[PDB]
């Protein structure tokens, strides 16, 4: 029962090369270079999937810091004010209010400013 | 002596970016009306209104 | 320079030829072994 591996090898190698499309040079053409580029891409994606949550919080905090400083206090005093006023609004929503509706954020800072 | 890694096809083609073919300058002879290279006799021998054979 | 082969027909037929093979017991074993392999050239 001789088994020829050409057919299964072809679609196996093709599966890796299809996943390596858009890569430069040998990384999208030859399997030996493409297989470890696909693995490395998956490793970056797994780590960057944690770092994304880490990077957007930095973005929200900076946006909130700009908004609070435009009218009144800083971010460090803003978060303390929201915490003392029992305001649960997340930094994601706050940064969206600051960047897209400045009247509401002005009213939102006042509630934090009167609480300290 | 020799390379430590194969040149990429891209890098090989950037060296070929000055590889052009020379295009001759042509003219029309006044007498025969034939096309010929500038400052050269026409294939049948005419250059600047003059016969060579 | 002088190379190793330097052919000579009388010397070739006298050390490797058909009658030289057949004149010894082991030379006939050489011929039998060429024939068992089916070689088209028995002797030089």
């Amino acid at each position: 029962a001789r088994v020829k591996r050409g057919v299964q090898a072809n679609r196996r190698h093709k599966k890796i090369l299809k996943r390596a499309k858009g890569y430069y040079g040998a990384r999208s053409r030859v399997y030996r270079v493409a297989v470890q580029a696909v693995t490395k891409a998956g490793q970056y994606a797994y780590r960057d999937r944690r770092n994304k949550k880490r990077t957007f919080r930095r973005l929200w905090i900076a946006r909130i810091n700009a908004g609070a400083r435009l009218n009144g206090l800083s971010y460090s005093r803003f978060i303390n004010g929201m915490k003392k006023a029992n305001i649960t609004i997340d930094r994601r929503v706050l940064a969206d209010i600051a960047m897209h509706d400045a009247a509401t954020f002005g009213a939102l800072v006042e509630k934090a400013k009167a609480e300290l | 002596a020799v390379q430590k890694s194969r040149k990429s096809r891209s890098r090989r083609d950037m060296r070929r970016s000055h590889h052009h073919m020379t295009v001759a300058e042509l003219s029309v002879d006044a007498t025969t009306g034939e096309k010929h290279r500038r400052h050269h006799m026409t294939k049948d021998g005419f250059y600047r209104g003059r016969q060579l054979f | 320079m002088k190379r190793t082969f330097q052919p000579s027909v009388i010397k070739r037929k006298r050390t490797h030829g058909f009658r030289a093979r057949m004149a010894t017991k082991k030379g006939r074993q050489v011929l039998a072994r060429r024939r068992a392999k089916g070689r088209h050239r028995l002797t030089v």
Binding site: - | H19, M21, V23, K35, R37 | -
Partner: protein, 109 residues
């Protein structure tokens, strides 16, 4: 339409003919022939031979006015390679590739 001529088997490297092909690509039937007849490259005799055959095919088989023709497409491919051995010093041999090229020309209005 597009009238095609092929010159499969030209005994010359493709790299040497791609230079000649890059100067007649897109040119009119007349400018391309002047470029080819006054070129110093060997690949120009091969391109002109294939270009001229494409012109006759348009004039004869397709009944098309050659005065309005143009070199619509041209590309040089790699052909079959003849493999030879070249002796070097110290009893070493290399492989020599004698490359050939295919020349495809398409003329059209």
């Amino acid at each position: 339409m597009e009238v095609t001529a092929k010159l499969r088997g030209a005994a010359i490297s493709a790299q040497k003919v791609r230079l000649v092909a890059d100067e007649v690509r897109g040119k009119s039937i007349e400018r391309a022939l002047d470029i080819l007849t006054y070129s110093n490259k060997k690949g120009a005799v091969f391109v002109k031979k294939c270009l001229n055959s494409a012109i006759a095919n348009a004039e004869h088989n397709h009944g098309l006015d050659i005065d309005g023709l143009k070199v619509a497409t041209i590309y040089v491919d790699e052909g079959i390679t003849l493999k030879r051995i070249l002796p070097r010093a110290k009893g070493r041999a290399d492989r020599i590739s004698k490359r050939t090229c295919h020349i495809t020309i398409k003329v059209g209005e």
